[model samples]
Target: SMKNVLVGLGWDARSTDGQDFDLDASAFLLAANGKVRGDADFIFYNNLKSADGSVTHTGDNRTGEGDGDDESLKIKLDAVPGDVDKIIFVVTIHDAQARRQSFGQVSGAFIRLVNDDNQTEVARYDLTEDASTETAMLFGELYRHNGEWKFRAVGQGYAGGLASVCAQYGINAS
Candidate 1:
């Protein structure tokens, strides 16, 4: 089995309202307790890499313009700490409350996981058609199942922004 993976997230915004939509990709490393061990386990634009270095964010993309994936993360499965049981991937809209933006205005939004070793797609979730009117979404997750890595699609949406998501994962985001 491949030990490395590349998680790619993309979206296109139709901004008829004149405000640009900024979408961000974030990850949370959770232990068996279903919560992050610490703030360092929350990987996002500001905190690009996990403390253990198993997960990393590429960067922020202010505009979801002309590209395959607006943002991405590199994950070394085997490099993850033994205590961590799952890596949760999420996508949230920046300034959603002030800008009044939501996934309903987004098109072609998707999260895909590719095998870094052979460039094969391991998992994909398309949010364009099924997305709800929410600012943040839980896209997908990679978790340890027995001794092998597994992928699950979690297309749930929420009303709040990144801070809410961080709180759910046990990080007191500042």
Candidate 2:
């Protein structure tokens, strides 16, 4: 599988009420069965690094402000263990339910992958789909195929917020 890559997630909140939009970039370290083995397998703001240290969240942007990659994550392809077959990326609205927020109010949402060697983006996706009632999305995935690294842009979305998404992956929200 390929090694050393960067993944960036960006977005802009259109609402002007000054209620900041807290977005998050999460990476799920999955086994061959496509399920996280435990809490250590989930990496996000709270859990910044995977147990294996292959996937790390440089940090998360609490408010969708500024420009160019509100959140950044680095992936060391070869550093990942063989048992971990997939790294699934997701963008979710933190506390979306209480804030009455949905992705439809956000703009410029995107996810891109960069080759660490050349620092050039190898793939990108503009998440401009219908986010009317969706509060979270499965942006993309990094997986292993025949001993090679591969990427997939999965735009699937869910109606719930981070709590729901976390529950689905067996992550304890608390």
Candidate 3:
């Protein structure tokens, strides 16, 4: 009983770099007890190019503002083997330029989880760099609740490195 789930979002960064940024990134079936067990099952990067050297999900391209394109990643959760318990959501801003723009400058990077049954947003995580920083990564958790699944937006914002971000999520990084 595998169901196809689609993760999508619309984001706008203040910076006007032609390069794409990672708005919402997730790892499904991370572990059995709501922990990262293995590699990421599915990852969706905004303005990402497909293996065929083609833009699979266009519209993510944005110059300044005004409704960024909708980007999505589709996956069959039932197809995932093992007793999958949770999914981790991470939002980040990519610096394609060698000079590296500060994440504090970039704005509006968020994550949304929609319920398949009702087609409504179940949870949302907002990652805002209100201050200036090199890079930022926010962590959130989604897990099975009651017989169905539910999401919780931890809303943890971090600057500097991924380790700091993970620490905010209470994830042990050794």
lDDT of each: 0.71, 0.69, 0.46
Query: Tens digit of lDDT per residue, candidate 2, span 62-160?
Result: 776776777788878787778778777777766666776666566657667787846755676555655663777776777888888887676677775
Query: Ranking by lDDT, best first?
Result: 1, 2, 3
Structural similarity to truth (TM-score) of each candidate: 0.80, 0.80, 0.56
Q: After superposition, how far is residue 55 of candidate 2 from its true place, in Å?
A: 0.8
Better of 2 and 3 by TM-score: 2
The parts of candidate 3 lying over 4 Å away from their true place are 1-5, 13-24, 33-35, 39-66, 75-82, 96-104, 107-110, 122-134, 159-174
lDDT of 3 by residue, 1-174 (tens): 213344555566455455444443434235555444533233344225322111133234333244533455444444444456565445455442344554444456544555443566545444454425335444455665665655666654455444334433335455
Q: Which ten residues in a row have the lowest lDDT in candidate 2?
A: 164-173
Task: Select the stronger candidate by lDDT from 2 and 3.
Answer: 2
Q: How far is 139's C-alpha from truth in model 2 (Å)?
A: 1.0
How many steric overlaps does candidate 2 have? Answer: 0
Once fitted onto the true fold, the runs of candidate 2 whose alpha carbons sit more than 4 angstroms away are 13-17, 39-41, 117-122, 170-174
RMSD of 2: 3.7
* Selected candidate, larger lDDT, 1 vs 3: 1
- Candidate 2 clash pair list: none
Alpha carbon deviation, residue 165, candidate 3 (Å): 7.0
* Winner by lDDT: 1
**What is the TM-score of candidate 3?**
0.56
Error of 1 at 8 (Å): 1.3
